Nucleic acid binder design. Structure first.
Lengths: 100, 137, 85
RNA sequence: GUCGAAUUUGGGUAUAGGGGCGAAAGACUAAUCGAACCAUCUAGUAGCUGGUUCCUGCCGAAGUUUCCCUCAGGAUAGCAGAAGCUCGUAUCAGUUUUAUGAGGUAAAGCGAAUCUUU
RNA sequence: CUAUCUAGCGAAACCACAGCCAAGGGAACGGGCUUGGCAGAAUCAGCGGGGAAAGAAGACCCUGUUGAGCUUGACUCUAGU
RNA sequence: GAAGACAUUGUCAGGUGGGGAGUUUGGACAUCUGUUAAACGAUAACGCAGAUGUCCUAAGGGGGGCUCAUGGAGAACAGAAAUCUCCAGUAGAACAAAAGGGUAAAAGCCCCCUUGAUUUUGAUUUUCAGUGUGAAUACAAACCAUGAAAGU
RNA sequence: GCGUUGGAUUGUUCACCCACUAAUAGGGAACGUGAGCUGGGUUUAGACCGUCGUGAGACAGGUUAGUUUUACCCUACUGAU
């Protein structure tokens, strides 16, 4: 859960900061249209909002599946699979981060 | 397939006020539960299949064309290590399950259409919530 | 007294310990499941703590279609300009 | 808390142990009650616990077999001591060598079968 | 008003032997063993860390061919009717 | 006054009878094939994949005949799918069933005769205390079955 | 080296807000700390409701009521001859 919140608190620092290109002003929208290309701008931020909600889904499952671990050799594996499937979302997100 | 003891996947549930009723058992491993299930009463039941450990869908990888498709499970035909866990549904490893194929749309002899296959799971779902099953070709 | 005996009742109507005029013969195994899970020092029931043999034999009546169903019954801008362009 | 009554209390008297009495707690019945106290049968029974009183010399173990409503115990076999008896080089031995048997395990083999040709 | 000090009176629990620690091994967490740190008579008032200090051959859990109380078409009987 | 050869009382007999009395309320257990099992044998675990509390007057005996599973080439119907026929066929078939052995002029498939699946009691093998129970093997004395005969 | 809080809902830690602040960091010492406290909750006997049982009673369970009480001893520590 603590790693799961750790990725979201970084993602909540991205989706809050960027200036929300629709409904700013039709001038500030339209400098950023020519200079930053609205399509690539809106797709990459919506990829992270997809990537934020998948971290919440994996964190809420692997705490809920972990409550029936009957040994140490089973509870360790649910910890590693919970961190690995979050790393899969990050490695997949390698290209939209360098643009942002 | 390693040998799975019966002392695991069964939990001593000591019930009542004075915790001395060592009767009830809980399956601590993963289970397909069926489509229409409607739990039996608590005074009537003996064996408990919990709510969190019920995987409905499974990752179905195909050796031919190399495509992994996320497909739902319909039935559990063959379970090793007893015929008893066939009726229960314990889904450890080597369990052959009956998986539909509707999105693939394969063509048979006569070309009517194929809508279901047989797939064998390949990993313990205790280690991860994913259920990986190689569709047997 | 002479009539209400186990030997003289079963002749009137026509083995598990505890069968009576009451519940049944089948209820005695059923109502003894509330005390069934105990280990006696013989381990407890449904916890054998042993490794079985899990073999899957090869059968030709696999690898195929399950039942049947008939023909009668039933862009990306990331492709053009990726990110750095 | 209750305090004019289903109140409180003295004396007399009635009910005695598988019985009494109970506006019911298994309560109470002489500091004892899910069955009073006293003496006898009685030194009741225990496959369970604790203890077992002088010195030196010699020999010296077992936790294993089969059976038992047997699994904290017995019976049987094994191992051990003691008494000795018939005889006196003797038949031998937790060992090698010569000769001759039986094996199918490691290796080898799938241009052997499908689990053994060697 | 005690505690405290004095005159008179004056017990009990408990007790193998007794009393400074760290580490190591160890019936699985030493007052004693082994290698170290140290160590000076006699003692008074507080104190509650330890002395597995003490209240209970444990209220907890298993055993016994050991009981008792209670219940029912368990077995065997019995007063009564 | 009431009642009367009935009640009552005595002795046996059936029915009822937790109101009461005494006591009890077990701990892969009997077995056969494979494997774990490591080249004699023996060897464990709530090791393991499977069988049994039956079945047959033949599916027990004896003698005579014959070759199976399977493929190739063919025959109005009839085709991959009955019957016919030939070439190859070390058993790939079959034997009441689990499983492991063993089996080709047979232990299989078909026919001929039958009751030894009998009587008397010993010796021996397996688990083993070398006790019992079970099952088994080789003889002797009979009396039989069968076969041309040896033999069984 | 030094510092890491005040409150709000259940026996509750679990789980999560409100505001301040330089900051509201994480852990251990028999999941520190009952012969320090607490008995709130953990475990008898009283009693009710629910499920199961013919029954005695047991619980899938919920609610309420409820006795373990040294220190003067040697050591440790704070003080005193």
């Amino acid at each position: 859960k603590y790693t799961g919140e750790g990725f979201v608190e970084k993602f909540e620092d991205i989706l809050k900061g960027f200036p929300n290109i629709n409904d700013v002003h039709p001038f500030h929208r339209d400098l950023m249209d020519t200079l930053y290309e609205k399509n690539h701008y809106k797709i990459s931020l919506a990829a992270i909002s997809r990537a934020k909600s998948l971290v919440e889904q994996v964190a809420r499952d692997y705490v809920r599946l972990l409550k029936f671990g009957q040994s140490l050799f089973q509870c360790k594996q649910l910890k590693r699979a919970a961190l690995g499937r979050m790393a899969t979302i990050v490695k997949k997100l390698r290209d939209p981060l360098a643009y942002l | 397939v390693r040998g799975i003891s019966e002392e695991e996947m069964f939990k001593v549930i000591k019930t009542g006020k004075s915790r001395s009723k060592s009767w009830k058992r809980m399956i601590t491993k993963h289970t397909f539960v069926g489509e229409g299930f409607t739990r039996r009463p608590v005074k009537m039941e003996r064996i408990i299949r919990p709510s969190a450990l019920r995987q409905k869908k499974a990752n179905v990888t195909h050796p031919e064309l190399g495509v992994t498709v996320f497909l739902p499970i319909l039935a559990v035909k063959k379970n090793p290590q007893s015929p008893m866990y066939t009726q229960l549904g314990v889904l450890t490893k080597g369990t052959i399950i009956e998986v539909n194929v509707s999105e693939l749309g394969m063509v048979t002899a006569g070309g009517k259409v194929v809508w279901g296959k047989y797939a064998q799971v390949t990993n313990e779902p205790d280690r991860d919530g994913c259920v990986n099953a190689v569709l047997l070709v | 007294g002479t009539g209400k005996k186990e030997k003289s009742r079963r002749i009137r109507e026509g083995r598990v310990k505890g069968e009576n005029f009451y519940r049944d013969s089948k209820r005695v195994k059923f109502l003894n499941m509330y005390t069934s899970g105990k280990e006696i020092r013989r381990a407890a029931s449904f916890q054998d703590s042993t490794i079985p043999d899990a073999r899957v034999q090869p059968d030709r009546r696999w690898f195929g279609n399950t039942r049947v169903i008939s023909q009668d019954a039933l862009a990306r801008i990331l492709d053009t300009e990726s990110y750095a362009d």
